[PDB]
Design an enzyme around this catalytic site. Structure first.
Site, PDB file in Angstrom:
ATOM      1  N   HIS A  40     -30.619 -14.445  35.155  1.00  0.00           N
ATOM      2  CA  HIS A  40     -31.599 -14.342  34.038  1.00  0.00           C
ATOM      3  C   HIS A  40     -31.779 -12.892  33.577  1.00  0.00           C
ATOM      4  CE1 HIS A  40     -35.007 -13.745  37.055  1.00  0.00           C
ATOM      5  NE2 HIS A  40     -35.482 -13.018  36.064  1.00  0.00           N
ATOM      6  N   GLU A  52     -32.755   6.384  42.602  1.00  0.00           N
ATOM      7  CA  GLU A  52     -34.040   6.619  41.892  1.00  0.00           C
ATOM      8  C   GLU A  52     -35.151   6.063  42.782  1.00  0.00           C
ATOM      9  OE1 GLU A  52     -33.748   5.482  37.625  1.00  0.00           O
ATOM     10  OE2 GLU A  52     -33.740   7.680  37.447  1.00  0.00           O
ATOM     11  N   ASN A  54     -38.661   7.475  41.847  1.00  0.00           N
ATOM     12  CA  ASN A  54     -39.484   7.671  40.630  1.00  0.00           C
ATOM     13  C   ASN A  54     -38.653   7.227  39.419  1.00  0.00           C
ATOM     14  OD1 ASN A  54     -40.906   8.717  38.388  1.00  0.00           O
ATOM     15  ND2 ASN A  54     -42.093   9.984  39.816  1.00  0.00           N
ATOM     16  N   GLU A  62     -29.584  11.336  42.081  1.00  0.00           N
ATOM     17  CA  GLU A  62     -29.431  10.017  41.388  1.00  0.00           C
ATOM     18  C   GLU A  62     -27.992   9.777  40.902  1.00  0.00           C
ATOM     19  OE1 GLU A  62     -32.149  10.228  38.079  1.00  0.00           O
ATOM     20  OE2 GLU A  62     -33.904   9.777  39.333  1.00  0.00           O
ATOM     21  N   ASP A  84     -29.402 -18.879  40.153  1.00  0.00           N
ATOM     22  CA  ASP A  84     -29.917 -17.671  39.449  1.00  0.00           C
ATOM     23  C   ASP A  84     -29.378 -16.444  40.191  1.00  0.00           C
ATOM     24  OD1 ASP A  84     -31.218 -16.002  37.670  1.00  0.00           O
ATOM     25  OD2 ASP A  84     -33.219 -16.267  38.623  1.00  0.00           O
ATOM     26  N   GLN A 174     -43.959  -9.369  37.322  1.00  0.00           N
ATOM     27  CA  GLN A 174     -43.094  -9.043  36.159  1.00  0.00           C
ATOM     28  C   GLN A 174     -42.499  -7.642  36.335  1.00  0.00           C
ATOM     29  OE1 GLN A 174     -45.723 -11.435  35.565  1.00  0.00           O
ATOM     30  NE2 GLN A 174     -43.866 -12.732  35.637  1.00  0.00           N
ATOM     31  N   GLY A 175     -41.182  -7.532  36.128  1.00  0.00           N
ATOM     32  CA  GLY A 175     -40.375  -6.305  36.288  1.00  0.00           C
ATOM     33  C   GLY A 175     -39.662  -6.205  37.638  1.00  0.00           C
ATOM     34  N   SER A 177     -37.932  -8.860  38.972  1.00  0.00           N
ATOM     35  CA  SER A 177     -36.790  -9.809  38.838  1.00  0.00           C
ATOM     36  C   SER A 177     -35.461  -9.148  39.237  1.00  0.00           C
ATOM     37  CB  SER A 177     -36.684 -10.322  37.391  1.00  0.00           C
ATOM     38  OG  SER A 177     -37.429 -11.519  37.198  1.00  0.00           O
ATOM     39  N   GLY A 178     -34.633  -9.839  40.021  1.00  0.00           N
ATOM     40  CA  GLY A 178     -33.280  -9.370  40.365  1.00  0.00           C
ATOM     41  C   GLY A 178     -33.261  -8.444  41.575  1.00  0.00           C
TER      42      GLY A 178
END
Lengths: 223, 163
Positions: A40, A52, A54, A62, A84, A174-175, A177-178
């Site tokens: 998704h 990362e 921050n 990084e 998924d 939320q945010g 995901s994955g």
């Protein structure tokens, strides 16, 4: 992550960000050139940030590497949220350090009641929105499939598990995901979905990674 | 399956932000509530010429992602994110037909999707997730445009963040 804590630099070195001009999804580094995330989260020309902690700094030990391939599970069921899972091949292997390392795939499936580490840069509030600057972490136990199917009638497939607190307080949000769900030092879950964040009887639902290792290994073999 | 975009070219958020639906065929129209049939309280969702820029909505998906894709099944609601009033559904009701209305519950997955349409977006209602969509349009009755299923004849919106 709601009810979590600051992970620390070096604490979750297998966490990545999926970026296309902004952060939109977490991911998991599983080797120097392969990332797992949610189907998704699929998007054209994704760029992966690694090392990362921050998310709003332009430098800090990084690496920013384009996807060369973004391969969604060929059974990904956008109606049922089933299967998924997505593999991303990086265009170049990451350079490994204190803040960049791979998580390994599980030998076997994790059992209900095992404690896990969930991490990401998603919302930290149950009602409203506060996005952190730094990676957040949460220990969340796996729930039985009977507990899970109960929480979400009709929707829990065989390729999903619930982790978290039916009491509320603590969840993905939320945010996130994955992002990774790591149990006994193995990637057991991918952050997928839930009814709200940290609400009573409404826990997180994660892609059951143990079911996919044959596919992952085979997809890496061939690509 | 692209990302839904507001008028400032920013992705539409999952529940965090409210957005005015701005018709491009009715400059003076904005979203609001009207009575239908015999009801004391306004529960049907209408465009009102007498009412720009409109009551704002939130687009909500259970997916733990803060972007909306045209492919995500959504809940659309008036009011605050978490709250369970002003949740949109479709009800067969005269004189309008398959009318967009508000109610006090929320399903896990909404029946609505946002889809690119010519120059903007349309709301598409799905009676079930496997099936093809029914565009949402307008029934001009008693001086207003009730939102309702009118397949092939969608109402086109731009999505302006309420800010």
């Amino acid at each position: 992550i709601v009810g979590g804590y600051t992970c620390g630099a070096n604490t979750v070195p297998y966490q990545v960000s999926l970026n296309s001009g902004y952060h939109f999804c977490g991911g998991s580094l599983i080797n120097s050139q392969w990332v797992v995330s949610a189907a998704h989260c699929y998007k054209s020309g994704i760029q992966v940030r690694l090392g990362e902690d921050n998310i709003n700094v332009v430098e800090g030990n990084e690496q920013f590497i384009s996807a060369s391939k973004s391969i969604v599970h060929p059974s990904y069921n956008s109606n049922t949220l089933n299967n998924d899972i997505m593999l991303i091949k990086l265009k170049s292997a990451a350079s490994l350090n204190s803040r960049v390392a791979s998580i390994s795939l599980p030998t076997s499936c994790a059992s209900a009641g095992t404690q896990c580490l969930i991490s990401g840069w998603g919302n930290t509030k149950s009602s409203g929105t506060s996005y952190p600057d730094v990676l957040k972490c949460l220990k969340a136990p796996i729930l039985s499939d009977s507990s899970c199917k109960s929480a979400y009638p009709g929707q829990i497939t065989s390729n999903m598990f619930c982790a978290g607190y039916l009491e509320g307080g603590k969840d993905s949000c939320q945010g996130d995901s994955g992002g990774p769900v790591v149990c006994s030092g193995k990637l057991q879950g991918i952050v997928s979905w839930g009814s709200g964040c940290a609400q009573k009887n409404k826990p997180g639902v994660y892609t059951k990674v143990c079911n996919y290792v044959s596919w992952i290994k085979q997809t890496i073999a061939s690509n | 399956s692209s990302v839904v975009v507001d008028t400032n070219g920013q992705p539409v958020s999952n529940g965090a932000d409210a957005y005015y639906l701005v018709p491009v065929s009715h400059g003076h129209a904005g979203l609001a509530l009207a009575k239908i049939g015999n009801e004391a309280e306004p529960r049907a969702v209408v465009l009102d010429p007498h009412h720009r820029p409109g009551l704002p909505v939130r687009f909500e998906s259970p997916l733990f992602i803060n972007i909306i894709k045209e492919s995500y099944f959504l809940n659309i609601k008036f009011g605050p994110s978490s709250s369970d009033s002003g949740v949109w559904d479709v009800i067969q009701q005269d004189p309008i037909g398959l009318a967009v209305k508000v109610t006090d519950t929320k399903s896990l997955l909404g029946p609505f999707k946002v889809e690119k349409e010519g120059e903007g977006y349309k709301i598409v209602y799905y009676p079930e997730r496997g099936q093809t969509g029914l565009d949402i349009g307008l029934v001009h009755r008693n001086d207003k445009y009730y939102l309702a299923v009118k397949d092939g004849e969608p109402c086109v919106f731009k999505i302006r963040k309420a800010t």
